[PDB]
Amino acid sequence: MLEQPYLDLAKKVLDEGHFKPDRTHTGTYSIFGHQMRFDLSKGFPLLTTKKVPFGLIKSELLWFLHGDTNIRFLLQHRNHIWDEWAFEKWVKSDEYHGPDMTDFGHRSQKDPEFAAVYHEEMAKFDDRVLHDDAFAAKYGDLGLVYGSQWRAWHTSKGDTIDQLGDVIEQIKTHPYSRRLIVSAWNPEDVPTMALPPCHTLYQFYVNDGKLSLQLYQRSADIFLGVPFNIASYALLTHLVAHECGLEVGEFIHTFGDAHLYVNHLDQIKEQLSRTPRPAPTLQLNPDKHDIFDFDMKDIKLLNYDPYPAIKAPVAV
Amino acid sequence: MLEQPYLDLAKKVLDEGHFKPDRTHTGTYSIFGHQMRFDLSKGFPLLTTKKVPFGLIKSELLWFLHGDTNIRFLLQHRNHIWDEWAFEKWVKSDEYHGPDMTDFGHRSQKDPEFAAVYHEEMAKFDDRVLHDDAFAAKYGDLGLVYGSQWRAWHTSKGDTIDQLGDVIEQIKTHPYSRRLIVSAWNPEDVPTMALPPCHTLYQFYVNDGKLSLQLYQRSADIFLGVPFNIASYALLTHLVAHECGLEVGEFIHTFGDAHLYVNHLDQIKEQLSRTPRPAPTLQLNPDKHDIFDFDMKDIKLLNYDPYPAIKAPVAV
C-alpha cells in the first residue's frame, strides 16, 4: 500500500542499522542515506498501521504558513508540540520563581512526583501564554522557527525574505525553474540554536501539470517523528498545488541520519505485523485558493480508518 | 563495478525521463528524486567508461578549500571552468572596449568567425587576470562562490563564518553529531545570483570509524556535469577523513532535478555500451594532514586507465 516505503524503512534500520549512541542517553540504530517516494494520487500518506493524529499536523502547518512563531496559536488549538522549547526559557528567567526544572524532560521520565511538578508549572506557563498578552509575546515567541525561516528570513541589511511566498509565485510564472527551493538552514544561527532544523531544505518540481516536493531531513526519528513528517509535507504539497492550480504528483522524502531509538524496538516490530488498509483522501476547500489565509476547516481527511495508537516512551 | 550507479542513472532518465524544455533552448529529459551510493573503499568513483580529467577536479576543489573566489588560481593551473562567469561581467563594464559579446556562449555555438572573436577577447581577459593584479581583483573575483560560501559566509552583523573549518572540528570533537552540515544556499543572495549553487547542501556522518558524505544537488547534468560532481565529492570526503584520521566509507549523491540535454543522447547511449574497468585508487600525502594547506601534488590517482573522452556539445 501507499505507506509501504515507511515500513520498509523500519524493517531496514533494524536489519542493517549500525548501533549509534548519541546526544541523549537513549541509544539508537541509524543509517545514512535513504529516499522514499509517495505517489500522492493514490491517497494522502497518513499511516493506517498506527493512528497518527492528523489534527496536530494541520494546527502546526498552518502555524508555519502564517509566519507564526508564537506558541499561543498552538495552545489555542490543543497542540502542545513546541511547549518545551518555550517553557525551557521560562524556567530559566529571573522572573520565574518556582522549582528547579533542570533539563526537566529527563526527570519527568525517571519521574518522581516531580512529573506533576513539571506538568504543574507547565499548566501555568500555558495559561499565561493564552491569557496574558505580554507574557505570550515574551516567552511564547520562539523567534527562530519554521514559520519565520520560511516566511521571514533576515538579510544582512535589515530586512525579511518571504521565501515560500516568493517561490510560490515562481512556481506560477516559472514552473520549470530548477530553483524552486526554500531552506530553514542558516549558518549564522545554527551554532547556538536549541533545535537546528531537521527538515533542512525542500524543493518543488512541476512536470506535466503535477507538483512534486523533495524534502531533505538530516535527522529522523522512525517510530515517533517520521509518521508526522511525511504528513506535514504530503499536506504542504497539496496546498501549494491547490493555490497554483496544479494537480498533485509525488512526495520524495530524503534522509541524512534516520534512526530508531533503542526503546521503540518492540513497538515498531509489533507495527510491522500489521497489514495496512487503503489510504485516506484529502479535501481542500475548493472555493479558497490562497493557502496562507487557510484555516483548519479547509482541510479534510476521509477514510482514515487506522489501527489504534502505539504508546512508546519519548527519547531523552 | 563502482561507477554502475551512474550508468543506471542515465539508462534511467532515458527510459523514464519526462521531456522538459528549460532555461536554454536545448531541451532536456528530467527526473526528480534520485540517490546514488558509492562505497569509497572499493576505489575512487572516477569514470572509466569515459575519460574524465581528474586534474581539473583537484584544481577546482583546492580552490574551494582555500576560500578562494578569484579565477586567477584556476587560470594559473590551466583550469578554465569559471571563466565565463567573470568574463561576462568584463564584457559588461564601461572599461571594456571591444565587440558585442551579448549572451556570447550561444553565438559561439551557432558560431560565425565570432567564436574566434570570443576566444580572442577571452585570451586577453585571461592574460590580464594573471599579470595585472588590479584587474584580477576587480574582474577575477566572483564574490559569491563555493570557496566563500563554504569558508566565508557573512552574518547580519558584519562578520564571516568558516562553515567547513568549524564542521571539521565538530567531526573531530563530536563525530556523532547529526548536524555536520554545510550549505551553499543563502536566501538573500539567491534572488539575483547568476548561477545559484547546484551543490546546494552537504552532510557528514561518522560510524565505526568511517566517514560518509551525502550531497543534495538540486540540479544535475548527467552527461557532462555529473561525472565531475561525483569526483569532487568522493575527493572531498577523503580529504576530510585524512585530516580527521578517519577511514573512508560512502558518498551518497542525492538529486533534485537530474537531466540529460537532448543533444547528448547519442553520446550517453554510446557510453552505455562500454564495460567499465576496475576503479582507480587515491593517494593522499601521508605526512600532510591539514587539507586547507594541501596543494595539487598531495593527491594521486592510480590505475586510472579510462576509455577515450566523448565529445558532446555544451548545452546553451
Ligand SMILES: O=C1OC(c2ccc(O)cc2)(c2ccc(O)cc2)c2ccc([N+](=O)[O-])c3cccc1c23
Ligand atoms: O530531540 C528532540 O528535541 C525536542 C525537544 C528537546 C528538548 C526539550 O527540552 C524539548 C523538546 C525538540 C525540541 C525543539 C524542536 O524544534 C523540536 C523537537 C523534541 C520535542 C518533541 C519530540 N516528540 O517526540 O514529539 C521529540 C522527539 C525526539 C527528539 C526530540 C523531541
Ligand SMILES: O=C1OC(c2ccc(O)cc2)(c2ccc(O)cc2)c2ccc([N+](=O)[O-])c3cccc1c23
Ligand atoms: O548552466 C550553466 O551555466 C554555466 C554557465 C552559464 C552561462 C555562462 O555565460 C557561463 C557559464 C555555469 C555558470 C556558472 C557556474 O557557477 C557554473 C556553471 C556553465 C558553465 C560550464 C558548464 N560545463 O559544461 O562545463 C555548464 C554546463 C551546463 C550548464 C551550465 C554550464
